[PDB]
């Protein structure tokens, strides 16, 4: 599924991301825009052989099991394919573990390079919330 901007903002709010670990909702919407263009089916392969999955591009080296990333962990205890569903619950629950691990949202390279330090509530501006 490809979300609209305000549709996704409202789904992330319902699932508890607004101000989670101090990150306002616009940060999460901005990260999803530049990681996946709001498409839950996005996949991208990395040089080390791992793959990134879903609307927040969660990586199989650490966070999910895809059966083809030897020596990797599965810290969210899920198959990576669960992160491609039109229901974003599995991606949100895993993202909450990632953002809690000490490095905050810097775990998402597109957030660091395209959202951090910008006017992020602009991403929610005008939505019903
Ligand atoms: Cl980037
Ligand atoms: Cl915001
Ligand atoms: Na893995
Ligand atoms: Na959803």
Curated annotation (Swiss-Prot):
Q: Which UniProt keywords apply?
A: Allergen, Antimicrobial, Bacteriolytic enzyme, Disulfide bond, Glycosidase, Hydrolase, Secreted, Signal
Q: Which Gene Ontology terms of cellular component type are present?
A: cytoplasm; endoplasmic reticulum; extracellular space
Family matches, as Gene3D superfamilies: 1.10.530.10
Query: Transmembrane region positions?
Result: none
Q: In which tissues is it expressed?
A: In the egg white and polymorphonuclear leukocytes.
Give the family, as the similarity comment puts it.
Belongs to the glycosyl hydrolase 22 family.
* Name of the protein in question: Lysozyme C
Taxonomy, top ranks, is: Eukaryota, Metazoa, Chordata, Craniata, Vertebrata
Q: Which gene encodes it?
A: LYZ
């Amino acid at each position: 599924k490809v979300f609209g901007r305000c549709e996704l903002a409202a789904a992330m709010k319902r699932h508890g991301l607004d101000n989670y670990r101090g990150y306002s909702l616009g940060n999460w919407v901005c990260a999803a825009k530049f990681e996946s263009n709001f498409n839950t089916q996005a996949t991208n392969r990395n040089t080390d052989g791992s793959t990134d999955y879903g609307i927040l591009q969660i990586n199989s080296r650490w966070w999910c099991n895809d059966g083809r990333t030897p020596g990797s962990r599965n810290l969210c205890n899920i198959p990576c394919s669960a992160l491609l569903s039109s229901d974003i619950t599995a991606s949100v629950n895993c993202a909450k573990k990632i953002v809690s691990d000490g490095n905050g949202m810097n775990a998402w390279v597109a957030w660091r390079n395209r959202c951090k330090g910008t006017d992020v509530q602009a991403w929610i501006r005008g939505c019903r919330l």
